[PDB]
């Protein structure tokens with residue numbers, strides 16, 4: 001809900017242990033069960049090239065920023081009802097700040 005820059009070093013560890021199973025960050029990177037996240041910030045939802053999203057993620061049409069990403073990551077299924085995933089969220093605010101600090105840089 002209210003992003004504050006944290007530790008990108010801790011964020012990189014959080015990405016490996018909590019996201020990397022389903023996502024990649026690199027430009028041209030592959031889709032896993034979830035879409036490749038290159039260019040995610042400043043783009044509307046459902047637009048990773050070559051990835052087929054649910055109607056819910058497409059219809060949400062959220063312009064990803066650091067704040068709505070933090071709210072989304074707390075509980076994705078609450079933010080986008082209908083989204084399909086075996087992911088429940090990053091409940092700790094410090095974790096979300098660190099993760100997003102790293103992600104903003106890694107997906108640029």
Ligand code: HEC
Pocket residue numbers: 015018019020021022023033034035040044045046047048052053054056057073082083084085086087090099103
């Ligand atoms: C697999 C069990 C997943 C984990 C762990 C995480 N995510 Fe995920 N994510 C997954 C799926 C299947 C999808 C698409 C869902 C759909 O409704 O089609 C997503 C989507 C995202 C998005 C939105 C992408 C977009 O709108 O273009 C983001 C921003 C995202 N996921 C980020 C993310 C992060 C940072 C994670 C670790 C905290 C993470 N997800 C976990 C599957 C899975």
